[PDB]
Symmetry: C3
């Protein structure tokens, strides 16, 4: 399964650790994504990183890259960039709170969490990760947008973020 | 009890300059000896939408039992989500009282004013600046004659108990 | 009940970077599901830590393949479970539940971007002196490790403010 849930009853939702690409940004299996969401009271503590492995991911054409995990209003996964687009518990306990992070609110500052990091861990390549909560007009979502450098390989190091949950 | 928060809301709940001029989110969740905290602050009325100063500070102060004494919230809404208060207070050995100036009492966050990439700002979260009891202080950079809004951010500190 | 590995909060130097007890380190790791939430800060107290000779400073905690601590910069290696989190004498715990995942953060992988977590902060909290903390997972070729490297300013005191980071665990 692409996203899997693990007990403390479910306390972790993650992409299982892998040594191989598990994600499709531009072409199939072109990248290795880690995404892990763990519940701590009203918070989800999230970690994310994304390593380019093949194709355009190793020779970027654009100055940013975005992916999104979208869920319906019950918290069921609808879509993700994962090669294994599947899921295998109260899902709303992991969804971003829709009162605080209003649906369709990507333009609202409080729906966005900004992280400074460095492309490929190179300090001469500062980039910014924007994590957005509930950009989707219905249901729930988590969006990740990183800046990038054209004609260079993409890799975003380990990062983390936190949001308040729906339940 | 794992969470202390101001409950999620979409209407103003906070008073920085005038009553109910802003929407504050502050949530503290306990994970062992840590509190994981999140905060954001959105201006909605008055000077918060047309700033007069280039920084904005708010503070939550608590007594030596962990009871809230003062905050900028319009109503007494900082509460247990629907208990030992000291398990949520910043550790007073590591973060000495009256320690606003001590580096280890301060936690820095980089963000962007109104999420605008031309407006990088710093948030300084300070533990136990108060001379007695406990405190959490937040100070953000701002730009005069512009609206203030600080995006979602987070921080982490070690607890007293 | 055991959720925390730490060096205890103290007001006295507890750490040796260049000379014995020259610094005050805080390091605390708390488990939340498949994550560790970590906090760290480092304050120079004496000697070269108050008058730096180099432009970066690094310390490392190494562990064996069971998660047992092998080396650290702490005087007497005072890094263990938080007292009072269990009523049992000599409480047991799964140390691998605190170790950085070795599939995601491969051993000897310090050159791999996903093994590194970058934090911006300010030297001595002076906002004119931005510095970068690099936390590296499993740099060591064997066992597990957490490495911390801060940039520094020569001929000045070193102190890094409160910071935090997060990684996925082995178990
Ligand atoms: C003397 O100038 C400074 C410094 O060292 O650069 C300015 C800096 O903003 C300040 N840090 C904070 C968090 O206030 C620091 C501490 O007060 C001092 O290091 C404590 O000993 O003093
Ligand atoms: C070629 O130089 C660089 C790069 O890519 O810019 C420098 C950068 O500091 C380094 N990152 C780290 C964490 O060391 C990176 C990786 O080692 C390499 O990309 C992995 O394949 O190599
Ligand atoms: N120096 C502080 C107290 C000790 C500290 O902050 O470390 C004060 O003058 O209140």
């Amino acid at each position: 399964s692409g996203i899997e849930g693990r007990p403390y009853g479910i306390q972790t939702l993650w992409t299982p650790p892998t040594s191989n690409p598990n994600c499709t940004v531009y072409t199939e299996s072109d990248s290795l994504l880690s995404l892990c969401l763990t519940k701590c009271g009203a918070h989800v503590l999230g970690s994310v990183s994304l390593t380019g492995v093949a194709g355009t991911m190793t020779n970027m054409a654009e100055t940013s890259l975005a992916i999104e995990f979208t869920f319906d209003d019950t918290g069921k996964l609808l879509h993700s960039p994962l090669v294994n687009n599947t899921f295998s518990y109260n899902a709303l306990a992991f969804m971003p709170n829709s009162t605080l992070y209003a649906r369709g609110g990507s333009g609202e500052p409080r729906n966005n969490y900004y992280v400074q990091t460095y492309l490929r861990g190179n300090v001469q390549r500062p980039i910014t990760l924007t994590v957005t909560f509930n950009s989707a007009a219905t249901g729930y979502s988590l969006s990740f947008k990183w800046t990038a450098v054209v004609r260079e390989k993409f890799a975003a190091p380990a990062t983390s973020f936190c949001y308040i949950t729906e339940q």
